[PDB]
Amino acid sequence: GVATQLLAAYILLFDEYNEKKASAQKDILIKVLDDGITKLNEAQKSLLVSSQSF
Amino acid sequence: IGEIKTETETTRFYVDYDDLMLSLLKEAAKKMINTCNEYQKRH
Numbered sequence: 001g002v003a004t005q006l007l008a009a010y011i012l013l014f015d016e017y018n019e020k021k022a023s024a025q026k027d028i029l030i031k032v033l034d035d036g037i038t039k040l041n042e043a044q045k046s047l048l049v050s051s052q053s054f
Numbered sequence: 055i056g057e058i059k060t061e062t063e064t065t066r067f068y069v070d071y072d073d074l075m076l077s078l079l080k081e082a083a084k085k086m087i088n089t090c091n092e093y094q095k096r097h
Contacts, residue, residue, distance in 0.1 A: 001060040006067055009078055024071050032067065 006032050058093060061086050 006028060013021060065086055068079040 002063045002067070005064050009068070021071055021073070028067055028070050031070075 003032055003036060058089055061089055 010025060010029065014025065018025075061082070065079065065082040068076065068082050071079070073079070
C-alpha cells in the first residue's frame with residue numbers, strides 16, 4: 001500500500017526531469033525498497049518456520 | 055490499525071521531498087485528518 005503510491009508519485013513527478021527534487025527522490029526510492037526487501041524476507045522465513053512445525 | 059499505518063507511512067515519505075507546498079503532501083495530510091476523525095468516532 002505504501003510502495004504503490006510512492007512509485008506512482010515517482011512516475012508522476014518525473015515525466016520531465018526535475019533537478020530540484022532529484023536528490024530526495026533517490027533517497028525515498030532507496031528507503032522504501034530497502035524496507036520492502038527486509039519485510040518480504042522476514043515474511044518468507046516466518047512462513048517457512050511455520051511449515052516446518054508439522 | 056494497519057489502514058491507518060499505511061497512510062501515516064505514505065505521509066512520512068512525502069515529507070522527505072523537502073517541499074511543504076507540494077500538493078501531494080497537502081492531500082495526504084487532508085486524508086489523514088479524515089482517517090483519524092473516523093477512528094475517533096468509532097471508538
